[PDB]
Ligand binder design. Structure first.
Ligand SMILES: [Cl-]
Ligand SMILES: [Cl-]
Ligand SMILES: [Cl-]
Ligand SMILES: [Cl-]
Lengths: 112, 105
């Protein structure tokens, strides 16, 4: 889709999470942004090594009808605090609404 | 946000020889400034590319400019295979889409 028919309701990832390194005990954040032409309930999920992070601390943002236009902008920030060697793995963001789910690139986290 | 912000990325596709193929890319700007839409194949400019460019200025009476560029490829040849990229720009800056691969069978 696009703006011609204002038909991109599925989330469109615009910012990918990035592969990072962190020291044990530090705080780590992963960010993923998306856009949509639909104002529909959104769901933000994060996974580590193909498994859901059920009690993940998140900071989710929705800018609906930005500047009075027809665009929706979203950002989800995964917050990892006091990271352990067990925090190491491939992190992935899943952004979805009832039109579809969009899967981010897998961002590797290395813990030293 | 005067520089264009890509909202829809072109998608990797497969097509049969002799068919028609289209790539689409959308962007938004808070600035109603002259817009340029360009498409490249394997980092090389497509100077005579057939395009359908759309500008929805002050959409719904708001202050947002919305744009879509459609690259049109007709009667694709095996030479049409490669990584396609969209560059959307105004005098504030250029935004580069992801590279979308086209496979020709
Ligand atoms: Cl990140
Ligand atoms: Cl496309
Ligand atoms: Cl290339
Ligand atoms: Cl710059």
């Amino acid at each position: 889709x696009g703006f011609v028919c204002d038909d991109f309701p599925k989330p469109q990832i615009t910012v990918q999470p990035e592969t990072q390194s962190a020291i044990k005990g530090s705080d780590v954040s992963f960010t993923c942004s998306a856009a949509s032409s639909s104002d529909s309930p959104m769901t933000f999920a994060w996974k580590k090594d193909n498994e859901a992070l059920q009690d993940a601390e998140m900071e989710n943002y929705a800018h609906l009808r930005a500047q009075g236009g027809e665009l929706m902008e979203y950002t989800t920030i995964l917050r990892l605090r006091n990271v352990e060697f067990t925090s190491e793995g491939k992190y992935q963001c899943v952004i979805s609404n009832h039109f579809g789910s969009s899967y981010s690139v897998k961002a590797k986290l290395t813990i030293n």
